[PDB]
Tab-separated table of C-alpha atoms and ligand atoms in Angstrom:
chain	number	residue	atom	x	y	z
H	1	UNK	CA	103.129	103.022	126.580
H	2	UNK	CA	106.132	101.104	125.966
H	3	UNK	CA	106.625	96.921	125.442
H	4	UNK	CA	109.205	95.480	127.655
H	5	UNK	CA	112.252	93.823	126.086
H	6	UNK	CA	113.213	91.625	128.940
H	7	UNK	CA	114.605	88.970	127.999
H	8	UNK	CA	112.595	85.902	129.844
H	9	UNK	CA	113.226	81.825	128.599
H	10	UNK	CA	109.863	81.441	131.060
H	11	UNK	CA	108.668	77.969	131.778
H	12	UNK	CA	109.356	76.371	128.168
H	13	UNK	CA	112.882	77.436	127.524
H	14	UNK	CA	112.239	79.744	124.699
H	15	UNK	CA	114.722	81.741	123.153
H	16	UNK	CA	115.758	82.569	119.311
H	17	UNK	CA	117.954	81.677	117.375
H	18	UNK	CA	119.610	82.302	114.166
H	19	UNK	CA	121.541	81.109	110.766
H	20	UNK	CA	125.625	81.660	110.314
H	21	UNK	CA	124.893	83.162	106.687
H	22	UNK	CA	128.668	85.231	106.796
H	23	UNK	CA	128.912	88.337	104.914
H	24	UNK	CA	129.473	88.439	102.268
H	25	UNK	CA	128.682	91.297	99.492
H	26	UNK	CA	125.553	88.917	97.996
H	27	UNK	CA	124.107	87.942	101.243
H	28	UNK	CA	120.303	88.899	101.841
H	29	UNK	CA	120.368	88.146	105.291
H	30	UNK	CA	122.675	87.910	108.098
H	31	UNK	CA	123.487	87.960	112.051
H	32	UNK	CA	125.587	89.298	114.374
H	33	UNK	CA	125.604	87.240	117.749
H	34	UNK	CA	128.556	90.301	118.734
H	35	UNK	CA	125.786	93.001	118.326
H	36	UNK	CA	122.677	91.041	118.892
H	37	UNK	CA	121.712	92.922	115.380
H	38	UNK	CA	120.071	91.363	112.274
H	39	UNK	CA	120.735	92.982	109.166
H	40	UNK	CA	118.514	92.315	106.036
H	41	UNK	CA	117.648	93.475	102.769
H	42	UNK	CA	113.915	94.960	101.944
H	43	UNK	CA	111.194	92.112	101.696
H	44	UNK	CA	114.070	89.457	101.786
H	45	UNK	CA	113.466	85.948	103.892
H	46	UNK	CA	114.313	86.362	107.417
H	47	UNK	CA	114.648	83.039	109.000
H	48	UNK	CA	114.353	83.081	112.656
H	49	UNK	CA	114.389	79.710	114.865
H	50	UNK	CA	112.109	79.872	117.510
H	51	UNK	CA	113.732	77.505	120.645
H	52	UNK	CA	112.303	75.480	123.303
H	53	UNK	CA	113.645	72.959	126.046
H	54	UNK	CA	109.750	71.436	126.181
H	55	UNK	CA	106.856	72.124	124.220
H	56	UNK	CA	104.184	74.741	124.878
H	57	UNK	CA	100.489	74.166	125.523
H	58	UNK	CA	98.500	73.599	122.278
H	59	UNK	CA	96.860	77.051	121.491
H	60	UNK	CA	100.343	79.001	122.408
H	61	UNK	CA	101.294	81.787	120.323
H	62	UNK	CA	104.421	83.700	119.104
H	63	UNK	CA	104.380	87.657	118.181
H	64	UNK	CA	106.812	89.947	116.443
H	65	UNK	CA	106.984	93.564	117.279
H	66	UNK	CA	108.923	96.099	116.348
H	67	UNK	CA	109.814	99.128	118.630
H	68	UNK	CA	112.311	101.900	118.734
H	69	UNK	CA	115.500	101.429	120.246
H	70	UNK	CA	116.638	105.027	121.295
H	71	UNK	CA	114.224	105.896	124.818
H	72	UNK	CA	113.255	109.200	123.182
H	73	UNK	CA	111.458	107.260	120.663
H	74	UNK	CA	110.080	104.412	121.954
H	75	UNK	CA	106.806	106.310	122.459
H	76	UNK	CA	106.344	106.479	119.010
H	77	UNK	CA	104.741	103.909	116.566
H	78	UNK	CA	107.058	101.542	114.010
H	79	UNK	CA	105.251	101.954	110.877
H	80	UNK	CA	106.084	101.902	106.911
H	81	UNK	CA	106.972	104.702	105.583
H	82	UNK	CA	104.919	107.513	103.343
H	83	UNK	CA	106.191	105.718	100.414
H	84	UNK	CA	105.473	102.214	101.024
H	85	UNK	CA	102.541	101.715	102.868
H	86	UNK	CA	101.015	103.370	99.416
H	87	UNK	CA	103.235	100.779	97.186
H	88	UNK	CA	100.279	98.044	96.984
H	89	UNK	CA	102.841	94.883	97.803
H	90	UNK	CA	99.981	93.632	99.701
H	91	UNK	CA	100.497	89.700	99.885
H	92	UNK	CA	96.676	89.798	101.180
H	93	UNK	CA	96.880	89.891	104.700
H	94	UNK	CA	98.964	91.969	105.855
H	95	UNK	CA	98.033	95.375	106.265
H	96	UNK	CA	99.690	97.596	104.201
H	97	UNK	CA	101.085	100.118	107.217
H	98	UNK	CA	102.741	96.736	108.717
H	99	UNK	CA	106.580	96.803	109.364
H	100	UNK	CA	107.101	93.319	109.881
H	101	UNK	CA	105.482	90.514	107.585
H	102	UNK	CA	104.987	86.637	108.205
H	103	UNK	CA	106.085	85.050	105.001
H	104	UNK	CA	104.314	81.479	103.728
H	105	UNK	CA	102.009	81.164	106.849
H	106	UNK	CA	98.473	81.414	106.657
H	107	UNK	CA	97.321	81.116	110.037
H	108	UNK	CA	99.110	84.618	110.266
H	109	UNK	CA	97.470	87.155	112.181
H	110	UNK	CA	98.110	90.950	111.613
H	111	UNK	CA	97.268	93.128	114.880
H	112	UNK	CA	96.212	97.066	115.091
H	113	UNK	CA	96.268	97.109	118.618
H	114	UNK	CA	92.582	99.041	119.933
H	115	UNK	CA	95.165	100.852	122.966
H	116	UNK	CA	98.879	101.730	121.914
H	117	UNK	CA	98.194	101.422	118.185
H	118	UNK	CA	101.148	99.411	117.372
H	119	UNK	CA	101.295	96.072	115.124
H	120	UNK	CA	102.137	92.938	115.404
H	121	UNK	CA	102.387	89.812	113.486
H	122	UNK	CA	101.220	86.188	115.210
H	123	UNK	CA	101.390	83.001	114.470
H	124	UNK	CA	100.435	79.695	116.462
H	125	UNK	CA	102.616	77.030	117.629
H	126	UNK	CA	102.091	73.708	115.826
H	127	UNK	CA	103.098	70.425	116.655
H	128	UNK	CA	106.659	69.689	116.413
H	129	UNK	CA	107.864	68.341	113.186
H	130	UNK	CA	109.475	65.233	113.592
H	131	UNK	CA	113.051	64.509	113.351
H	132	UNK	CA	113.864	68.398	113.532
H	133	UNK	CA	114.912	70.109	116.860
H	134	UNK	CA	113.439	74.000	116.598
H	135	UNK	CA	110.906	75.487	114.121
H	136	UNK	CA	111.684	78.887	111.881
H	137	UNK	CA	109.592	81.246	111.050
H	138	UNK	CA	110.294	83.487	108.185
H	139	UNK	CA	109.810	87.342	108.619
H	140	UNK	CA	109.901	90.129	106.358
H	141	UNK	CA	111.146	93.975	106.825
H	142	UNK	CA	109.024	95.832	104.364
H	143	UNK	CA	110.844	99.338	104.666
H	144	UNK	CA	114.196	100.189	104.935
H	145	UNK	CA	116.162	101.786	108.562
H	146	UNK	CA	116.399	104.948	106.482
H	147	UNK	CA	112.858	105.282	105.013
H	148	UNK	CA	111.703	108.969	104.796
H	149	UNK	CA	108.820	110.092	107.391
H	150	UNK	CA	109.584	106.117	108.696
H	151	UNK	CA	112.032	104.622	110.579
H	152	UNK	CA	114.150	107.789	109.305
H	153	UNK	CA	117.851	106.044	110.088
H	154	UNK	CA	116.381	104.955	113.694
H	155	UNK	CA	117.500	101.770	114.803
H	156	UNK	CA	114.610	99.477	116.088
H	157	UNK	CA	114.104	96.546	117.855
H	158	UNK	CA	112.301	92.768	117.279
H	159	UNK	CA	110.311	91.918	120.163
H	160	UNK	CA	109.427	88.229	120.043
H	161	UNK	CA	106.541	86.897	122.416
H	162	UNK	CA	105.964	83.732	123.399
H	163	UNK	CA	102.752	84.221	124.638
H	164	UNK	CA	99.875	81.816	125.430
H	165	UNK	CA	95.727	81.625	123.950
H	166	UNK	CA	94.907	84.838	126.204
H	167	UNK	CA	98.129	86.561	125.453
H	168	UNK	CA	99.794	86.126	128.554
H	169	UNK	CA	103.465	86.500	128.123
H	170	UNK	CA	105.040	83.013	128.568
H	171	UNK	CA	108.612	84.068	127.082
H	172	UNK	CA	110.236	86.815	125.738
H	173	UNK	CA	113.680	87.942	122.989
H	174	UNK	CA	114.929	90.549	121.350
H	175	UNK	CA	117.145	91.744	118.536
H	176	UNK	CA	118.195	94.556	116.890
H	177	UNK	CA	117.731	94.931	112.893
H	178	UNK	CA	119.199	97.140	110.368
H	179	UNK	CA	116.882	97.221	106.966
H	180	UNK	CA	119.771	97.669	104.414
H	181	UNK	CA	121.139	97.479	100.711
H	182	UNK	CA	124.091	95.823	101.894
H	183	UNK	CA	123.781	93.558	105.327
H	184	UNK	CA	127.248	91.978	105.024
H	185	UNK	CA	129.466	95.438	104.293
H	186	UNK	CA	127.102	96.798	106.971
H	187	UNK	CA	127.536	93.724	109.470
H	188	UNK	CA	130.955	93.649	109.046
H	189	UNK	CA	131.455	97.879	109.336
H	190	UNK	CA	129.575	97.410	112.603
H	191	UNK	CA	131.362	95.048	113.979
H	192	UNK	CA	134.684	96.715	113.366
H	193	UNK	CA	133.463	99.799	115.013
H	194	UNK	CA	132.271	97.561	118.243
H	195	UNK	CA	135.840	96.081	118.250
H	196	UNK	CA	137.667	99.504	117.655
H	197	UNK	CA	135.497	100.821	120.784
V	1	UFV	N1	106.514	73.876	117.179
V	1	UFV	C1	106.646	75.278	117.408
V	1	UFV	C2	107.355	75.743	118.515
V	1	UFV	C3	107.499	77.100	118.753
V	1	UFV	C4	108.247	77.588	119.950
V	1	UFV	F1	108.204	78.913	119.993
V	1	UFV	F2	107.683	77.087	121.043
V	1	UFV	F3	109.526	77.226	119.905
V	1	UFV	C5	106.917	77.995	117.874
V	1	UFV	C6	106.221	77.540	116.771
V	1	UFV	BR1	105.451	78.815	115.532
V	1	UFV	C7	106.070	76.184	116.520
V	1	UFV	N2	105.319	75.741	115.383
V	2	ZN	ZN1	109.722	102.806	103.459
C-alpha cells in the first residue's frame, strides 16, 4: 500500500550522499542538507553518491522510487503528467509514464510493479572503481512538482533501496525533491522560511 521510508544503513553502511553545488540563479541542481530536499531542473543530471562502509554481495541492487510526501497521498501513484508521458523523450528504456530516469546506464531496469503499480528504476552494484571512495549514479526528474493532472504542486519523496538479487531490503534513504525552474532561488526561499519558523 505504502513503501516505508525508514531510514536503515543495514549491514553495509549505506547511506546517500550529495554535491555542495550552492545556489546560485544558473545552477541545475542543488541540495539542502537543512531540509533533506533536492531541488532540480526538468531532465537535468542529478548526481547522487551512493555510500558504503564495506561492499555488498555481487548481484546487489539499488532502486529509486518516488512516493508522495503528504499521508493523504501516499496511496496514490507518482507518475508523469498528461502532458509528458505523451512528449516522446523516450531515451529507449524507460517507459514513458516513468518519473524518475537512470541517465548513461544500461544495465538500467525500469519496473511496473504487477501489485501496487508503482515504478521504479534499478541498477546493479559493480565493482568498486579504484582509487575513488563512493559511486554516483545520475537520476533524472522528467516532470516538474507542479505538472497538471501530475505531481500537481505535491511534494514527493526519493526512496533509495539498497536491496539484494531477490529484492530483499539490505538498506534504505530518503530525500525530498522539488522539480523546478529555479532550484537555487527556490533552495534558498526554503531555507529562509525553515529559519524564520
Ligand atoms: N560500487 C557500487 C556501490 C554501491 C553502493 F550502493 F553499495 F554504495 C552502488 C553501486 Br550502483 C555501485 N556500483
Ligand atoms: Zn509533467
Amino acid at each position: 500500500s505504502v513503501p516505508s521510508q525508514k531510514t536503515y544503513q543495514g549491514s553495509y553502511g549505506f547511506r546517500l550522499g550529495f554535491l555542495h553545488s550552492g545556489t546560485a540563479k544558473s545552477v541545475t541542481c542543488t541540495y539542502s542538507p537543512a531540509l533533506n530536499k533536492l531541488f532540480c531542473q526538468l531532465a537535468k543530471t542529478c548526481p547522487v553518491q551512493l555510500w558504503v562502509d564495506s561492499t555488498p554481495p555481487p548481484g546487489t541492487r539499488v532502486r529509486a522510487m518516488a512516493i508522495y510526501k503528504q499521508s493523504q497521498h501516499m496511496t496514490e501513484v507518482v507518475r508523469r503528467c498528461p502532458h509528458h508521458e505523451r512528449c516522446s523523450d523516450s531515451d529507449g528504456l524507460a517507459p514513458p509514464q516513468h518519473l524518475i530516469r537512470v541517465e548513461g546506464n544500461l544495465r538500467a531496469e525500469y519496473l511496473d510493479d504487477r501489485n501496487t503499480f508503482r515504478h521504479s528504476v534499478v541498477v546493479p552494484c559493480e565493482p568498486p572503481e579504484v582509487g575513488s571512495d563512493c559511486t554516483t549514479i545520475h537520476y533524472n526528474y522528467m516532470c516538474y512538482s507542479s505538472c497538471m493532472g501530475g505531481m500537481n504542486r505535491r511534494p514527493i519523496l526519493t526512496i533509495i533501496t539498497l536491496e539484494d538479487s531477490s529484492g530483499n531490503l539490505l538498506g534504505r534513504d530518503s530525500f525530498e525533491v522539488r522539480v523546478c525552474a529555479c532550484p537555487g532561488r527556490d533552495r534558498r526561499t526554503e531555507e529562509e522560511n525553515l529559519r524564520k519558523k
